[PDB]
Design a binder for this molecule. Structure first.
Ligand SMILES: *[C@@H]1O[C@H](CO)[C@@H](O[C@H]2O[C@H](CO)[C@@H](O[C@@H]3O[C@H](CO[C@H]4O[C@H](CO)[C@@H](O)[C@H](O)[C@@H]4O)[C@@H](O)[C@H](O)[C@@H]3O)[C@H](O)[C@H]2NC(C)=O)[C@H](O)[C@H]1NC(C)=O
Ligand SMILES: *[C@@H]1O[C@H](CO)[C@@H](O[C@H]2O[C@H](CO)[C@@H](O[C@@H]3O[C@H](CO[C@H]4O[C@H](CO)[C@@H](O)[C@H](O)[C@@H]4O)[C@@H](O)[C@H](O)[C@@H]3O)[C@H](O)[C@H]2NC(C)=O)[C@H](O)[C@H]1NC(C)=O
Ligand SMILES: *[C@@H]1O[C@H](CO)[C@@H](O[C@@H]2O[C@H](CO)[C@@H](O)[C@H](O)[C@H]2NC(C)=O)[C@H](O)[C@H]1NC(C)=O
Ligand SMILES: *[C@@H]1O[C@H](CO)[C@@H](O[C@@H]2O[C@H](CO)[C@@H](O)[C@H](O)[C@H]2NC(C)=O)[C@H](O)[C@H]1NC(C)=O
Ligand SMILES: N[C@H]1CN(C(=O)c2cnc3ccccc3n2)C[C@H]1C(=O)N1CCCC1
Ligand SMILES: N[C@H]1CN(C(=O)c2cnc3ccccc3n2)C[C@H]1C(=O)N1CCCC1
Ligand SMILES: *[C@@H]1O[C@H](CO)[C@@H](O)[C@H](O)[C@H]1NC(C)=O
Ligand SMILES: *[C@@H]1O[C@H](CO)[C@@H](O)[C@H](O)[C@H]1NC(C)=O
Ligand SMILES: *[C@@H]1O[C@H](CO)[C@@H](O)[C@H](O)[C@H]1NC(C)=O
Ligand SMILES: *[C@@H]1O[C@H](CO)[C@@H](O)[C@H](O)[C@H]1NC(C)=O
Ligand SMILES: *[C@@H]1O[C@H](CO)[C@@H](O)[C@H](O)[C@H]1NC(C)=O
Ligand SMILES: *[C@@H]1O[C@H](CO)[C@@H](O)[C@H](O)[C@H]1NC(C)=O
Ligand SMILES: *[C@@H]1O[C@H](CO)[C@@H](O)[C@H](O)[C@H]1NC(C)=O
Ligand SMILES: *[C@@H]1O[C@H](CO)[C@@H](O)[C@H](O)[C@H]1NC(C)=O
Lengths: 729, 729
């Protein structure tokens, strides 16, 4: 075989690209899509297309455009430029608006520079935006905006945007605003960061910056003072240019105010109904609150009877946060993924005035998401098929009979497609399926009415040709049985696999609570190269604590972080040499983030099983990470709660055992998420007991070391280390 | 040969110790010295000895003692405990005093905790001390102290102690107080740090510290706002417990106040005369000021006529700062090392009212220090002998005839002793010589009167026995001629040197202005091990910019830092392969601090001469280091001064050329001196142009990475890297 291999350059220089088919539905039958640099609008029934915005319409604007948003009446286009990243989701941009009819960009009362956030109303053309931490409402794209709040202060009070910890661990968003469907109301949370300690660190910046900057961020580490939250709603119809605006407080429920709480979900039900979810700072108790609007008063009442109590006896509420509720149009009921009696997460029918819910699904598998609700059907993604947790399909359930369920994706392309996800049009007339493994990604449009497939949207046939020229590796997905339970793993095997030759093995890891590293998705990444070019088995394994296989597995790690999930990776490595094609002198292990923490705990176990490891951005000690996440699993680090295991579980206490292995610690110096301090303490520990190891800092890089030059650099560096331990040229 | 070699453990575990003979003269014939843990007093004429303080006299004190100081009348002992390091010289301690006669430690009016500084008067038992940045005077060891100043503020105003930059680059001391010989006056400088930018960085501290501390320090980087200085004197006799104390300002001279200046020397002449030296922020102009005391007034006048103007046409004033003046007893004259017409530094006789000075020495060598002044003789250290800059001896000059000079150390032990230094008794009746190379360190006591040697004090005969058991390397000191000038080098050659075998070579470097790495001193260090055990030639070389060989050499680098001193190391390496015993495939290079900066510039030169280098704590760009030092050599970094070479001389601009070499960057994260930022920018540069290299951070370590565990760790790490590039097992 004389074909080239998938090289390190291929991945790094990014030579073989998966084509995507990213669309934005704008109606019930049309969607928007990008071809080169103009925007095409498409008809879902027929396929036909038209130019909407040319890739020269903003030649003369003298500012490079970053994104764009379309008002829910096709009338105006928002243009996002001057983009500046903050955290995972946050940023600041400048914005201009363009009247699509008059072909003209607005000049009077512009959206101010460095805006934190901006979102259209659901109907019409109302904007809202957050700038210097306060909410503003523009009724029409060119009249003066109404200031809704006046409390906004840098690092202290956030109005309608989340703070650091809320952004990352609760909302997965900078945005803290919710319009009502009508567009009449605006609900927003407000966050108070006054007593929250700051993390401080250096940003060295460009060579021209003579003095390094100290970045400071309110960041509550385990057991420290959390942000407080308050919630307000405002009638955007009764807005005066003389009176300030009357915001209306919705207090948390009685059973939340007696201690620290978090606001963890905001979903509108109907024009005059909003549901709120709250979580105790001990995250095993959650309360949902139906808050109805009152005419006579101009206040929002939350009747104590309407509260629905979601709690857990064996661990924490929700996968990461508690599930979203999905409301029937009238608003008197809703479905919501909940953990059942046996422990598996399923769909539950809630009627808004009664206590009990009815389970409309069941069995030893879990529901991933609810995706669409019609009169007749609920559409959901699940891993039911072939009893494979790793897999993802799409199902519909007959509201008239919970027994009648059709699979809609299982049998569509079975050898190529075992992992689906979906986007539905505005009222669910069509749905794009996106398959993303085990074959090359496939994108197809469908019609809800009869479940007819219309056309294939992108098949990666161009990429498929190319890959035939290349000694591509394959993926084995399988399971191994420990303690009478089934745990799943994946191996990326090198091409021309000879099962009687002994191969060196890299165990890729994350293993954070409820994660999944053994799946049916097709990836082109570092592992491929180590399989194609270097002939290394790169295997991943989902052990206790892992996701999508019921609470009995996921909750095994409760308050015991850094125990079973670690232990398990070790036994996983053991069974891999038992299989006979593994060189038990050349087993390595590596991970990023949480994975870097498990990586280090493993090397630090003295199990003689691993020759070397790499840890990128590792958690090193749970009291160093954020409170919301850390506590969710570990409790509080106080002598009465879980201080003792908080101590029994540091990388540092395991320093002496590293004498037996080769270790490469990597960390970005600007890591706001897992602070450089986490590693700074792993290394000091190592130094102190006389252990040699390799380090690499990455200056100004954050948690994802995303910078193009840094990325290439790290995967280069990592590769050398890897080959070196394995004796390859 | 079956003898063991000098191993890495030997150096690290510190197996073969040089014995020292450290004494403190306390009179004209007695000195103090430590045997185990008691203090012995000695007679210089006869050798006899007595216990002074037993190593059990402070068993019952319940506090471990760090040092001790003896009042200039043998009456009380100061005891320094609770020692806490700050910078190179600064610290804070607790202090107790012990009445030696009554055998009792004082309890009323104790010296307060966290004292910055404390120093006895020259006669009697007056203390002065600095605590929370203010001067206090205790007249007797147990009456309430008098507060001299009230302006003291953390980080802002320093009374009688220096600030960061003054400590390091000007006074080489925390102490900023000077008693008059009588003990009547107290002069002190006061430093104002108000507009000085701060360097900020993280200190991660013990594992128990959940949030990393930000250390902030006023530190003026090149061209930034410097501290201002003011100078005061106080009559400690007229001190009232009702009136505050009247300090008396001595303003700098007219020709200093018109711009930024530094106070760079304070020497008392007689009971009522103090000399002050000042330096322009452009350090090529210095002015000394004779300030006489006035009876009638109670003020100090500095007559403009008495000023002595030291300046330079070819570079900067002084070696690092301008030389100390040494006063004849009456006070009307003094000697002072000055750079002569030809460029060599020599002794000059100054009479306090006339302009010209007379040179009392001359020739193509330099004076290192003045050491003693009597009626009849001036005692000085110089490198005159054998025309060897590397060497150090002791000379005396007949005040009655500048022609009659005797060498006093040259011919004392010639095969073993080429590098001397001295400590004289109170009125110069005796002097301990300390030789420290090329043989094992030797310590001998002498009598001034006739230059009789009395006895040998320590010869390291115990160490000498041991070393015979070991395959010790030798040192070749020699010179090579470039551009018709003589430049000196040293090679540590491995044992059983075969001059027809080709050896791998490590070029050790510092090469900062006026340094000396090629000398006759006997060291037992990392180089030895690389010579004894690994058979590597470790050679050092003093090129342009280097010290002790006249201004023509030292001033060659003026405003051209990072040019000739770099270029020269390269040509030094060239001539080393020309010699025939050097493997020109295995030449490496390394240095610390400045040396790390030259190291990096060299690897970054694309000269194909070096295979690999190590840089520890490197300067990376001159605008990142402190102003006083940086400007002394480079000027100001402004478009009109020397901004252009300030730019032409960064490591970063040389990033692409590193593709051709192996590089190990090391830095301590708590480096107050050369900030972590210096390397943080070398690495970011490297990342950016796709170059692979090895890094190691050292958390909480400072510029000397002195921590026991860190030390061992770095020299371990460094060793692996070294062997790896050289292909050794
Ligand atoms: C996909 O391709 C589609 C078919 O070409 C196309 O649908 C329409 O295209 C154009 C523009 O949208 C339509 O022309 C316009 O139609 C309206 C309505 O016309 C009807 O009504 C009038 C009066 O009531 C009658 O006199 C006519 O005979 C007709 O029935 C007109 O008012 C406009 O002036 C204009 O003529 C066209 O009718 C639509 N086609 C059909 C037959 O459905 C989409 O635009 C294409 N979509 C994309 C994604 O580009
Ligand atoms: C080194 O060894 C030295 C010799 O032993 C020693 O010098 C002296 O030792 C002791 C203690 O310091 C002295 O004893 C004391 O001496 C004084 C002076 O004595 C003279 O004067 C009186 C009256 O004027 C006469 O009556 C005497 O005869 C004598 O001449 C006495 O006042 C004390 O009470 C006491 O007796 C001794 O005299 C010194 N020795 C000599 C002869 O020089 C050092 O102490 C030793 N030093 C060290 C480093 O330990
Ligand atoms: C956002 O920032 C820019 C720059 O500060 C502003 O752009 C200027 O706009 C004026 C008036 O239209 C122009 O004449 C200039 O050409 C622009 N300045 C620049 C960048 O050179 C803009 O006004 C700001 N927008 C808002 C709403 O604050
Ligand atoms: C310096 O610090 C220590 C501790 O704060 C002080 O020592 C205490 O002294 C009192 C009275 O003598 C004792 O009873 C205690 O035993 C000591 N405390 C401790 C360390 O346990 C001391 O007084 C301080 N000195 C000054 C001058 O401020
Ligand atoms: N913040 C942790 C969670 N993350 C997620 O990507 C994630 C996944 N599912 C969510 C569901 C709901 C809300 C938030 C969610 N966040 C990143 C993790 C992370 O960076 N570290 C660093 C060390 C330990 C884990
Ligand atoms: N501060 C620099 C000077 N030093 C000395 O050790 C020294 C030598 N002779 C002196 C004479 C008078 C006053 C002060 C003196 N200081 C350390 C150097 C140093 O750390 N770096 C870091 C990067 C560049 C140089
Ligand atoms: C939207 O619905 C709300 C219900 O509160 C109603 O009061 C409002 O007038 C409606 N606005 C429109 C015109 O859609
Ligand atoms: C935020 O919280 C603190 C209480 O910790 C309070 O004193 C402060 O006024 C609050 N700020 C606002 C405006 O909500
Ligand atoms: C609204 O509130 C702001 C801040 O409290 C205040 O400055 C302003 O006067 C108010 N506006 C009016 C006109 O009521
Ligand atoms: C939630 O967790 C706490 C932690 O100690 C525990 O005491 C309690 O049993 C749990 N509460 C509920 C309501 O399940
Ligand atoms: C010391 O000398 C000074 C000269 O100013 C004199 O005034 C003072 O009284 C002297 N003190 C003693 C007793 O030594
Ligand atoms: C120090 O300097 C500043 C001038 O930069 C001055 O305003 C301040 O008062 C001074 N502090 C003292 C007490 O000398
Ligand atoms: C001395 O000065 C300090 C600070 O200016 C002041 O507080 C004190 O009153 C003064 N002492 C006396 C008693 O004159
Ligand atoms: C000192 O250096 C400056 C720097 O530009 C130079 O202009 C001048 O010639 C020198 N001054 C003296 C007095 O030598």
């Amino acid at each position: 075989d004389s074909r080239k291999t998938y090289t390190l350059t291929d991945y790094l220089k990014n030579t073989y690209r998966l084509k995507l088919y990213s669309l934005r539905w704008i109606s019930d039958h049309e969607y928007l899509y990008k071809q080169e640099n103009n925007i095409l609008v498409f008809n879902a029934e027929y396929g036909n297309s038209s130019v909407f915005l040319e890739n020269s319409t903003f030649d003369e604007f003298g500012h490079s455009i970053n994104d764009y948003s379309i008002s829910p009446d096709g009338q105006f286009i928002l243009l996002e430029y001057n983009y500046v990243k903050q955290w995972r989701h946050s940023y600041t941009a400048s914005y201009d608006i363009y009247d699509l009819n008059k072909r003209q960009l607005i000049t009077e009362e512009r959206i101010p520079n460095n805006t934190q956030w901006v979102t259209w109303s659901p109907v019409g053309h109302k904007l809202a935006y957050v700038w210097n931490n306060d909410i503003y409402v523009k009724i029409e794209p060119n009249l003066p905006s109404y200031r809704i709040t006046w409390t906004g202060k840098e690092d202290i009070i956030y109005n309608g945007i989340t703070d650091w910890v809320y952004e990352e661990e609760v909302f997965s968003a900078y945005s803290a605003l919710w319009w009502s469907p009508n567009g009449t109301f605006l609900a927003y949370a407000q966050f108070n960061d006054t007593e929250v300690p700051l993390i401080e660190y250096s940003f060295y910046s460009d060579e021209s910056l003579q003095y390094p900057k100290t970045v400071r961020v309110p960041y509550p580490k385990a057991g420290a003072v959390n942000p407080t939250v308050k919630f307000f709603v405002v009638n955007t119809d009764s807005l005066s240019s003389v009176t300030n605006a009357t915001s209306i407080q919705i207090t948390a429920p009685a059973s939340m105010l007696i201690g620290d709480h978090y606001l963890c979900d905001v979903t509108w039900a109907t024009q005059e109904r909003i549901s709120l979810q709250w979580l105790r700072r001990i995250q095993n108790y959650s309360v949902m609150d139906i808050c109805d609007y009152d005419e006579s008063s101009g206040r929002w009442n939350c009747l104590v009877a309407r509260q629905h109590i979601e709690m857990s006896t064996t661990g924490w509420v929700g996968r990461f946060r508690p599930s979203e509720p999905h409301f029937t149009l009238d608003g008197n009921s809703f479905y919501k993924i909940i953990s059942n009696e046996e422990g598996y997460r399923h769909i539950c029918y809630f009627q808004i005035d009664k206590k009990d819910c009815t389970f409309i699904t069941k069995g030893t598998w879990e529901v991933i998401g609810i995706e669409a609700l019609t009169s007749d059907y609920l559409y959901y993604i699940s891993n039911e098929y072939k009893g494979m947790p790793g897999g993802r399909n799409l199902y519909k359930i007959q509201l008239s009979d919970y027994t009648k369920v059709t699979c809609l994706s299982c049998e569509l392309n079975p050898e190529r497609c075992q992992y689906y996800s979906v986007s539905f049009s505005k009222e669910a007339k069509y749905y794009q399926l996106r398959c993303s493994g085990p074959g090359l990604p496939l994108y197809t449009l469908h019609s809800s009415v009869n479940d007819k497939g219309l056309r294939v949207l992108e098949d990666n046939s161009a990429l498929d040709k190319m890959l035939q020229n290349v000694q591509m590796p394959s993926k084995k997905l399988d399971f191994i049985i420990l303690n009478e339970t089934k745990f799943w793993y994946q191996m990326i095997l090198p091409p021309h696999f000879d099962k009687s030759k002994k191969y060196p093995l890299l165990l890729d890891v994350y293993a954070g609570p409820c994660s999944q590293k053994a799946d049916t998705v097709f990836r082109l990444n570092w592992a491929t190269y180590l399989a194609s070019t270097e002939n290394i088995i790169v295997a991943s394994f989902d052990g206790r604590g892992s996701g999508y296989q019921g609470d009995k597995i996921m909750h095994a790690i409760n308050r015991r972080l850094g125990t079973f999930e670690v232990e398990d990776q070790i036994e996983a490595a053991r069974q891999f040499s038992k299989m006979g094609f593994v060189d038990n002198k050349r087993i390595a292990i590596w991970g990023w983030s949480y994975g870097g923490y498990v990586t280090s705990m493993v090397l630090g176990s003295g199990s003689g099983v691993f020759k070397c490891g790499i840890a990128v951005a590792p958690v090193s000690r749970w009291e160093y990470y954020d409170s919301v996440y850390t506590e969710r699993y570990m409790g509080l680090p106080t002598p009465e709660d879980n201080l003792d295991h908080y101590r029994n579980s540091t990388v540092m206490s395991r320093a002496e055992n590293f004498k037996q292995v080769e270790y490469l610690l990597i960390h970005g110096t600007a890591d706001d998420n897992v602070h450089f301090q986490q590693s700074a303490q792993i290394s000091k520990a190592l130094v102190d007991v006389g252990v040699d190891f390799q380090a690499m800092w990455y200056t100004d890089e954050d948690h994802g070391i995303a910078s193009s030059t840094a990325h290439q650099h790290i995967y280069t560096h990592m590769s050398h280390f890897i080959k070196q331990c394995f004796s390859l040229p």
